[PDB]
Amino acid sequence: AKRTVKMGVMGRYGARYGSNPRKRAKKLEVSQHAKHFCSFCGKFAFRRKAVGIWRCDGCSKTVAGGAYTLSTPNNTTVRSTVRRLRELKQS
Amino acid sequence: DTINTKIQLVMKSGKYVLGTQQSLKTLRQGRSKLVVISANCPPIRKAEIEYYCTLSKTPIHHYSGNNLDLGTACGRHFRACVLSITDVGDSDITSA
Amino acid sequence: KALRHTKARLAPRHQKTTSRPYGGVLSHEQVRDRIVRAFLIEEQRIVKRALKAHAKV
Amino acid sequence: KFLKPGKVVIMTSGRYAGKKAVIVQNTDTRNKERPYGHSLLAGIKKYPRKVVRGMSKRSITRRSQVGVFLRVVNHKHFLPTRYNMDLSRELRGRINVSDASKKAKSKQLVKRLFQARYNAGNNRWFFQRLRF
Amino acid sequence: YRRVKELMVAPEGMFTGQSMLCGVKAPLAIGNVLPLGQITEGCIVCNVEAKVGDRGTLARASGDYCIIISHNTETGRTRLKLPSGQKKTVPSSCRAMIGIVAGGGRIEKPVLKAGNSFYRFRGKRNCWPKVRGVARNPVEHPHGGGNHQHIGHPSTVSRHAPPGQKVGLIAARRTGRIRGSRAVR
RNA sequence: GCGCACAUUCGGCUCUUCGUGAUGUUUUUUUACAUUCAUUGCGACGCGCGGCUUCCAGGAAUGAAGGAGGGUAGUUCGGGGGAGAACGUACUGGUGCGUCAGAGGUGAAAUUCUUAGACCGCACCAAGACGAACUACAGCGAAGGCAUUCUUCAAGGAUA
RNA sequence: UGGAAAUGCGAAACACUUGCCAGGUGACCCAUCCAUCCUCCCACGGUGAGCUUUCUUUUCACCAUAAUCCACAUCUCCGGCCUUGCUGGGGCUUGGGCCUCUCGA
RNA sequence: UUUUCGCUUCCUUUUUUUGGUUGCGCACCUACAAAUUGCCAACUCAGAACUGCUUACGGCGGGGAAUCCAACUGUAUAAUU
RNA sequence: GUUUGUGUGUUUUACCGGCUUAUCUGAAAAGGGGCAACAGAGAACCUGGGAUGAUAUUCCAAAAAGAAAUUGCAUGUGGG
Numbered sequence: 010a011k012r013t014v015k016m017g018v019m020g021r022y023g024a025r026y027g028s029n030p031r032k033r034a035k036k037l038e039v040s041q042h043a044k045h046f047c048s049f050c051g052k053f054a055f056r057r058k059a060v061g062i063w064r065c066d067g068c069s070k071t072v073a074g075g076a077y078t079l080s081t082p083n084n085t086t087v088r089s090t091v092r093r094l095r096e097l098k099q100s
Numbered sequence: 101d102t103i104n105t106k107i108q109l110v111m112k113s114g115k116y117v118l119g120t121q122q123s124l125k126t127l128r129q130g131r132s133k134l135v136v137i138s139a140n141c142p143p144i145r146k147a148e149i150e151y152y153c154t155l156s157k158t159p160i161h162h163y164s165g166n167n168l169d170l171g172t173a174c175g176r177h178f179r180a181c182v183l184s185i186t187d188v189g190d191s192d193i194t195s196a
Numbered sequence: 197k198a199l200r201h202t203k204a205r206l207a208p209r210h211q212k213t214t215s216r217p218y219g220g221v222l223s224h225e226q227v228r229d230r231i232v233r234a235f236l237i238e239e240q241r242i243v244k245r246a247l248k249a250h251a252k253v
Numbered sequence: 254k255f256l257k258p259g260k261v262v263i264m265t266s267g268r269y270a271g272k273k274a275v276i277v278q279n280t281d282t283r284n285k286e287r288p289y290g291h292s293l294l295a296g297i298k299k300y301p302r303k304v305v306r307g308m309s310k311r312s313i314t315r316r317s318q319v320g321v322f323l324r325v326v327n328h329k330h331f332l333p334t335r336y337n338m339d340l341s342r343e344l345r346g347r348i349n350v351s352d353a354s355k356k357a358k359s360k361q362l363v364k365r366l367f368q369a370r371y372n373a374g375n376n377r378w379f380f381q382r383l384r385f
Numbered sequence: 386y387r388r389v390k391e392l393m394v395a396p397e398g399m400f401t402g403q404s405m406l407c408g409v410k411a412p413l414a415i416g417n418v419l420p421l422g423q424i425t426e427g428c429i430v431c432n433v434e435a436k437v438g439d440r441g442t443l444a445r446a447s448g449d450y451c452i453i454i455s456h457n458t459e460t461g462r463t464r465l466k467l468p469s470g471q472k473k474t475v476p477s478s479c480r481a482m483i484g485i486v487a488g489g490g491r492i493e494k495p496v497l498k499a500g501n502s503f504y505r506f507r508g509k510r511n512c513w514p515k516v517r518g519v520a521r522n523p524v525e526h527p528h529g530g531g532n533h534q535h536i537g538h539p540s541t542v543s544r545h546a547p548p549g550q551k552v553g554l555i556a557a558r559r560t561g562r563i564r565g566s567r568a569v570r
Numbered sequence: 571g572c573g574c575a576c577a578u579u580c581g582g583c584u585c586u587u588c589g590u591g592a593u594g595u596u597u598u599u600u601u602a603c604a605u606u607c608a609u610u611g612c613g614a615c616g617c618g619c620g621g622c623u624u625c626c627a628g629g630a631a632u633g634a635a636g637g638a639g640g641g642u643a644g645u646u647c648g649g650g651g652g653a654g655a656a657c658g659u660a661c662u663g664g665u666g667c668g669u670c671a672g673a674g675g676u677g678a679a680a681u682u683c684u685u686a687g688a689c690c691g692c693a694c695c696a697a698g699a700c701g702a703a704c705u706a707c708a709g710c711g712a713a714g715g716c717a718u719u720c721u722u723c724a725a726g727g728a729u730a
Numbered sequence: 731u732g733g734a735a736a737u738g739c740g741a742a743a744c745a746c747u748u749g750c751c752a753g754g755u756g757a758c759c760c761a762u763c764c765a766u767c768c769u770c771c772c773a774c775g776g777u778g779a780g781c782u783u784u785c786u787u788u789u790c791a792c793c794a795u796a797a798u799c800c801a802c803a804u805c806u807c808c809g810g811c812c813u814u815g816c817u818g819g820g821g822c823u824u825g826g827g828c829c830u831c832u833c834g835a
Numbered sequence: 836u837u838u839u840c841g842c843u844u845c846c847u848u849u850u851u852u853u854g855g856u857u858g859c860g861c862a863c864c865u866a867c868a869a870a871u872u873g874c875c876a877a878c879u880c881a882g883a884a885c886u887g888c889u890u891a892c893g894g895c896g897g898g899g900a901a902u903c904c905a906a907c908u909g910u911a912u913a914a915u916u
Numbered sequence: 917g918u919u920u921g922u923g924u925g926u927u928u929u930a931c932c933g934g935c936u937u938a939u940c941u942g943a944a945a946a947g948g949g950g951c952a953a954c955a956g957a958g959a960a961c962c963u964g965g966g967a968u969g970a971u972a973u974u975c976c977a978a979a980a981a982g983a984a985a986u987u988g989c990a991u992g993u994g995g996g
Contacts, residue, residue: 023670025907026497034494040567051140051167051179060491063398065501072398073487075448075492084397087429087450088415095413122830129255129329155255155333161778173234201756202959214737216270218385221753223825226737231271234385235263235332238362267735288828289733298731312932320731327734327827391747402752499909514910569697570663 040078048072055079103163104173106194107136107185111174114188118174120145123184127152132184134159134194138170140181149182158184159194254281256292258367259339261379262331264296269324274331275338277323277349286377288369290328293351295363297321300381310360319371319380321364323356338370338379394441396431396450397487402515408480422477426453430481433465437479444468448492450485470568518552526546527552 013080015084018038019031019097025049046053056065063079072082080088111117117126118194125130127149135153137146137160152162170180185194197211217225226230254278256262256384274296283290299320308316343366347357371380391402396416405411407418429452431442444451444467451486454494455464455475463477496502497516506513519527519535527549531537540554 022907027906030495030497034497035451037494049140049142049386053569061488070400072400073395074398075486075488076490077494080398087485088427089654091413091415094428100437117830118832119830128254128256144233144236147240148232151236153337166833177834178222178832200754200756201957204755205959210739210741213742215738216266216268218751219270221751221755225825227270228265231263231265231383231385232332235271235383238383265735267733267737268731283828287734289734325734329827330734386750392752500909502779 037077045079104109106191108173110185110188110191110194114185114189116183117144117183118176118180118183119180123182126184126186127156127158130156130188132156132158133184133187134161136161136163136185137182138166138181140167147181257334258344259337260333261336262333264326265330269296269298271383275340277344288327291325292293292328293325295321296325297380300334300339319364319367321360321367323360336376336379338376394432395481395487413483417483418480421481422456422461424453424481426456428453429485431484431486434479435473435475435483437454442523447488448490474563488570511516
C-alpha cells in the first residue's frame with residue numbers, strides 16, 4: 010500500500026547498488042516504460058517490448074524507434090532536417 | 101482559428117455528427133452539409149470519405165489538426181478524426 | 197474450424213468452408229478492409245492518370 | 254443523397270466478396286421490414302471466363318457467362334461506384350417483383366440483359382474482377 | 386498476389402514490408418534507397434556501404450546514421466563522415482537507405498548487475514565475466530606472479546609485438562588521463 | 571415656431587407602383603417596350619387600407635463604471651522571449667603554394683621559431699567562434715538579462 | 731451454390747503455377763493470479779458389507795472406458811396432418827445488427 | 836405540448852402531407868417501502884464469560900556495543916584453505 | 917404423318933470427358949550429400965477378462981470380451 014518517498018521502482022534493489030546509479034537508472038525507468046503517443050491513432054499506448062520495440066496498442070502499429078524512449082531528438086531533428094533538406098531539395 | 105471558431109459555433113448551434121460511421125451515414129443521407137477531417141486519419145478513410153463527400157458535393161474541410169484538438173473543440177473529450185456537420189445554419193462561413 | 201496440426205487431415209472441408217477469397221482464413225473485417233483499400237486506391241490511380249491526361253492535350 | 258439504380262456499386266460480404274452490383278432500387282430507409290436501410294440490388298456473382306485467341310473448336314462459348322443474383326443488402330455493405338449501368342430499358346417500366354419467383358424471373362432476363370450490355374458494350378469494367 | 390518482399394536490416398520505424406522503390410528512382414522517404422552521391426550533402430543516411438554491394442557495412446551498429454560531408458563530383462568521390470572521428474571517402478556511387486538507426490544505443494543506460502551482464506553478452510561465444518592479467522597464471526600469461534598485485538614492465542609496447550608478448554596497450558602514443566585532446570587543435 | 575396653396579420648389583428614389591408571366595403600343599426611339607403607359611394575370615413590395623385573426627411581449631423590470639479593477643477590439647512599437655535558417659568577418663588551426671635570414675617576444679630580455687625551414691605574403695580550406703565601428707544618459711526586458719538577416723513561433727507593452 | 735450481416739451446406743467437385751498465403755497450419759520463455767475443468771478430499775444422504783460385551787450412528791465399500799450422435803420438449807402445432815420451422819443450455823470469445831452514449835458518461 | 840416516437844379517427848391547409856384530434860403503442864419507478872420476509876450457509880477473526888495451573892508434544896532467531904577488512908548477491912582450490 | 921414422350925443400336929459422326937502409350941515444350945541455391953533427437957517437432961485402441969506358473973493398451977475368436985480406430989487394396993452397388 011505504501012509508495013516510497015523518492016525512488017519508485019528502485020525499492021527492488023533496496024540499498025544495494027548505490028544512489029548515483031539509482032539516479033542513472035531512475036531516469037530510464039521513467040522513459041522507457043511510459044506509455045507514449047501513437048502517431049496516427051493518437052493516444053499514448055506505444056509500449057516498449059524487447060529493447061525499445063514499440064507497438065501501439067490500439068492501432069497495432071509497430072515502430073522501430075529505439076532505445077529507451079523511442080525517436081531521439083536527434084532523430085526528430087533529423088527528421089526535420091530531412092524535412093527541410095529534402096523538401097528544399099525538391100523546393 | 102476560423103475553422104475552429106466557425107465550427108465552434110457550429111457545434112453550438114449546429115448539428116453535426118462526430119463518429120465515423122455516423123459520418124458516413126450522414127453523408128449518405130446527405131444530411132451532412134460538410135465533412136471535416138483531422139490530420140489523424142487512417143488515410144483510407146480520408147479517401148473513402150472523400151469519395152463520399154465529393155459524392156455529396158459536401159465540403160471537405162481538412163481541418164488541419166488533431167484528435168484531441170478536434171474533440172476539444174467540438175466540446176468533447178475523446179480522440180477525434182472526423183466530423184460531418186449535418187446542419188448548422190448560422191455558422192454560414194462553414195457553409196461558405 | 198480451429199484445431200491443431202494432426203487434426204486437419206481429418207478436418208472436413210465442409211467444416212472448413214465459410215468463406216470469401218483469401219479469407220477462408222478470415223471472418224469479415226480484415227477482409228473488408230483489404231477489399232476496400234485496393235478498390236479506392238486503384239480508382240485514384242486511374243484518376244491520377246486521368247488528371248494528367250487533360251494537362252497534356 | 255445520390256444513390257439510384259443503374260449506378261454501380263461494389264458488394265462486400267455475404268457471398269459477394271468485393272463483387273459488383275447495380276442499384277436497382279434503393280431502400281433509403283430502415284423500417285421494421287428491414288431494420289436497416291438497405292438497397293435492393295441486382296448483382297453478379299460470376300464473372301465470365303476468358304475471350305482470347307481462337308480459343309477452342311466451337312468455341313468456348315462455355316466460358317462465355319455472367320451469373321447474376323439479386324439481393325437486398327445493407328447500405329453499410331457496398332462501395333458505390335460513380336459508374337452506372339442504367340436501369341432504363343431494364344426497369345423503369347419493367348420492374349422486378351420480389352417475391353420469390355419474381356425475383357427469379359427478372360433475374361433471368363436480367364441475365365440476358367446484362368449480357369447485352371456485356372456483348373460488346375460499354376463499361377466493360379463492370380463485369381469483372383478487381384485484382385485484390 | 387505476386388511482388389518482391391521488402392524487409393531486412395532495421396532503421397527507423399516505418400512499419401515493415403513497405404513499398405520502397407529504389408535506387409535514384411527512389412523518391413527519398415526515410416530509409417529509401419538512393420545512391421549516396423545522389424543523396425545530397427549533409428543528408429543523414431544510414432547504413433552506407435563502403436564496398437558497394439554490401440548493403441550497409443558502415444554504421445551497421447545501433448544508433449547512428451552518418452553524414453555526407455562531401456561530394457567530389459569530378460571523380461564521383463564522396464567524403465562522408467564515419468561516426469567515428471573518421472571520414473571515409475568512398476565513391477559517391479554507393480547505395481544507402483535514408484536515415485538512422487531506429488535504435489540509439491542502450492549504452493547510455495546504466496547496466497546494474499552481473500546477471501544483466503550475463504544475459505547481455507550471450508548471443509555469441511562466451512566472453513565475460515573477466516578476470517585480469519595480474520594473477521592469470523604466469524605460464525600462459527604475462528602478468529601472473531610478482532609476489533603481489535602489479536604490472537611488470539611498461540604496458541606500452543611496439544605494435545609489432547609477438548603474440549604472448551602482445552596484449553594490452555598497444556603502442557600507446559599517449560595513455561592515461563586525457564589531459565589534452567586528440568587530432569586537430 | 572408651426573401650419574400652409576403645389577411635388578409643377580431645392581429634394582426623395584421605384585413614395586413618378588414593384589416584380590414577373592407576357593401580349594400590346596414602340597418601328598434612324600431611351601432597340602424589346604414588363605412597372606409606369608395600353609392590354610391583362612398572379613405574386614407583390616413600398617405605402618395604405620381592410621379583415622383581423624390568433625398568439626405573444628416590459629420602461630429602468632436588473633444604481634451610477636472610479637484620472638478602481640478587468641478585459642475586450644485597432645494599426646503599431648521595441649537588442650522581450652523562443653525556435654529557425656543565412657552570414658559577414660576574424661581568431662586559429664590547416665592547407666596551397668612564394669620565398670627566405672630571420673623570426674619572435676620584451677621593462678631589460680628572457681624563456682620562443684628557425685633555413686627539414688621559422689616568420690612572411692597571397693590563394694584556399696578546414697574548424698570552432700563571434701556578430702565587430704555602426705550605436706547611443708539611446709531602445710527593450712520582472713529581474714537576472716537582452717544587438718546580421720531572414721524565416722518563423724508563440725509573447726509583451728504602450729498608444730487608439 | 732444459403733442468410734444485409736456476423737455467418738450456410740452429402741457433394742456449392744476443380745488438381746500445376748504463384749520473388750503465394752506477418753497462413754498460432756509445426757512455433758514454443760517464464761510470468762501472473764484468477765477463473766474454473768480434471769482429479770482429488772470432506773461430508774449428507776442412502777445402500778450394502780464388515781465392526782462394535784459396561785457407551786456410541788464405527789469402518790470400509792458403494793463404480794462406468796474409449797469410441798460416436800445430439801432430433802426431447804418448449805416453440806412450430808402438444809400429436810386432424812402436424813406440415814413454418816425444426817426455435818430453444820450454460821458460460822468464456824469475438825463478431826454482427828439496431829439504436830447511437832457528448833450535460834460526458 | 837414551435838422537435839424526426841409511431842400509427843388510427845376526425846378537423847384544418849390542396850393534402851388521403853404536416854399540424855391539431857382521437858384510440859392504442861413508443862421514451863419516461865412518475866409502478867418507486869422494506870426489500871420485510873423465506874431458506875440455507877460458513878469457519879475465520881473477535882468478544883465475553885465460566886474454569887484451573889502447566890519452562891512441559893512438536894516444531895522454536897540470542898542480543899548489544901565498536902575496530903579492521905570486502906560494496907553487494909555471485910565465484911572457488913575435487914580431497915587441509 | 918406430325919410434333920412430342922420413351923426405350924434400343926456394339927450405327928455413324930461430330931464434340932466433350934478420361935486414360936495410357938506417345939511427341940514437343942518445360943526448375944535454382946544456408947543449401948549441388950546424406951546422417952544427426954530411446955524426451956523437441958512427433959500422424960490409427962479403448963475399457964473388461966470364473967483372464968499366466970512366469971507376458972500382454974500384443975494373449976481373449978465367432979456369438980459374451982466387446983466395442984474401437986486406421987491403412988492398403990480391392991469389389992458391387994449406391995451417389996454416378
